[PDB]
Design an enzyme around this catalytic site. Sequence first.
Site, PDB file in Angstrom:
ATOM      1  N   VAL A   1      -8.443  27.238   2.134  1.00 49.27           N
ATOM      2  CA  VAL A   1      -7.824  28.174   2.910  1.00 49.27           C
ATOM      3  C   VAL A   1      -7.985  28.122   4.398  1.00 49.27           C
ATOM      4  CG1 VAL A   1      -8.624  29.997   0.973  1.00 49.27           C
ATOM      5  CG2 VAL A   1     -10.212  29.259   2.727  1.00 49.27           C
ATOM      6  N   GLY A   2      -8.716  27.195   4.894  1.00 48.69           N
ATOM      7  CA  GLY A   2      -8.584  27.042   6.403  1.00 48.69           C
ATOM      8  C   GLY A   2      -8.305  25.529   6.745  1.00 48.69           C
TER       9      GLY A   2
ATOM     10  N   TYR B   1     -11.938  21.701  13.653  1.00 51.10           N
ATOM     11  CA  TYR B   1     -13.540  21.743  13.395  1.00 51.10           C
ATOM     12  C   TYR B   1     -13.801  21.330  11.972  1.00 51.10           C
ATOM     13  CZ  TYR B   1     -13.620  24.095  17.907  1.00 51.10           C
ATOM     14  OH  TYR B   1     -13.479  24.367  19.331  1.00 51.10           O
TER      15      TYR B   1
ATOM     16  N   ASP C   1     -14.727  31.035  22.109  1.00 50.74           N
ATOM     17  CA  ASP C   1     -13.469  30.872  21.277  1.00 50.74           C
ATOM     18  C   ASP C   1     -13.244  32.169  20.536  1.00 50.74           C
ATOM     19  OD1 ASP C   1     -11.148  29.351  20.759  1.00 50.74           O
ATOM     20  OD2 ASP C   1     -12.319  28.312  19.007  1.00 50.74           O
TER      21      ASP C   1
END
Lengths: 339, 267
Positions: free
Chosen positions: A27-28, A32, A145
């Site tokens: 999903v991401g 990172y 961030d």
Amino acid sequence: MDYDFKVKLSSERERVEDLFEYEGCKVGRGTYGHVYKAKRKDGKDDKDYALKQIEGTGISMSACREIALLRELKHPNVISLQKVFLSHADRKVWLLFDYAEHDLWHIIKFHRASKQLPRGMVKSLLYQILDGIHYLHANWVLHRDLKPANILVMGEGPERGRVKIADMGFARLFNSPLKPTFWYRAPELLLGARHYTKAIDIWAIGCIFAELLTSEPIFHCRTSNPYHHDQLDRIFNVMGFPADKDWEDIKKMPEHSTLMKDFRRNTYTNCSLIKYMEKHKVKPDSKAFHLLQKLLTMDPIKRITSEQAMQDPYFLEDPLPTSDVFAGCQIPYPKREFL
Amino acid sequence: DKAMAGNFWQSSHYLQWILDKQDLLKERQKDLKFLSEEEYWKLQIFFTNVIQALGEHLKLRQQVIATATVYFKRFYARYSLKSIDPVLMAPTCVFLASKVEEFGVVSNTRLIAAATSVLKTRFSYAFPKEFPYRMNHILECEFYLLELMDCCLIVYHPYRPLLQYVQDMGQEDMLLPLAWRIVNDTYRTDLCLLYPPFMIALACLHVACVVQQKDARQWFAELSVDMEKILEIIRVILKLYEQWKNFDERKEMATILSKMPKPKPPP
Ligand SMILES: c1ccc(CCNc2ncnc3ccccc23)cc1
């Protein structure tokens, strides 16, 4: 290394691939690390989980600090680390969290594509974001961030409509922005500020709050150098150009002379946050506006703190902030698509 | 680095890594089949000195060196000296502690060169052969260390509260250098596993006051603290200095290291 010690620990070690079904549920896909929606294989768990596979191998500096800080941080509005898996064979690190169905990037995009349904939604979101950031700041942890994609919101379940702050920039060399979207970046960063600060996080919250009120990024705009001309142009087009009295220490900023070379006060003479927000149907005499103007202060030393913002009479005015930002109303937002 | 500075009472340090003294002694009996109690304390002193020299060579600040020392003690608080070679564990602890900070980085080649150089130039009395481990061994050992410690990486130390206490006294010039040095010395004992750091700080400041003939009885009276626990810590500090006097690590450590149980190979 002792052999019995080795085989005993191997026998007892929990492996992520044994406990969780996650294959094909990515999903991401950031730099990172990749994030997966996971379901428990063992106990017939109804709940969804998020598994983050950290990018690269071994334990890098960024991986170490993220594990170190998440291991200690415990607050309802900060994403909560449940478990760390260390996969020996391939030297990968996996982080387990509770799954957040929504986030502000998708929620804001939905509204922008459609054209804040329950009248306290924007307010409740703002309050919970400030509450989470305040907890970080009180522990001397900066986010560094902040943007809509890193403000998660829990879906159906025990924590329905609760904000979770995620994707903290846990590793920055010497706490410096100068070491390897600019829409949420404070003007001092763009003028070469050498260190991240609490104030830099607060500016970003200001930007998010404006975007929730209007559905548009307020400082929307098209090298290692921190100076970005068009991003500064967009801030002045909205805010106006700061007077000497508004930001006395601007002269100490490393890119101040570059600013003076490129920019004239006269260019922005009819520009202000009042005029910008009036065009987007936000009242200048509303408590919402007055708080927003305190968050988007150009001079960082004149910027409001998270605790002060939480005390603003805006949060005492009807409607009051709610723990479920959806206010018990049916969630119309789509679930995330798998990649 | 002040991350989590006021969070001790909800920290993993406090809630998981302040140990019961009898649990600690119970787990230690497996190694006391090989070494006397005195020999085991002499070994832990020796490796505290190894870690200090490694950290000094690499130019790390004292807090980082202290964190690395706590990681080492935590590992051997639960496991036998035979589980992983302490010669390998020491530089691995320094390496991991260095990565918890963000002001610079220790590279692979610099870590290995530091272990090799420090063991030969400063510890040749204990070790006849060169540092035999390569970086792949450090990386393997780091995974085991992180796992045993349950990923508990943020560690609290007595330096910060000591600094606050000496400033409160208005005695920074007189008492701070000595009190700081006594804090360093407490890492040659189990105190960091048994007591909150602020209590260790107070006991170190008390010893510093006694050594320098400084009357601070009224100042200690204005604190709300269990003084019985402070006196317990003082007694361990005074005991360390008597052991220090009677211990010649240079003459004894090669013999004590040979008595350590050693890791069993595969079949
Ligand atoms: C665009 C914007 C945001 C995202 C969020 C991806 N990240 C996540 N998604 C769901 N649950 C999580 C739980 C803990 C940490 C991260 C999560 C994905 C795409």
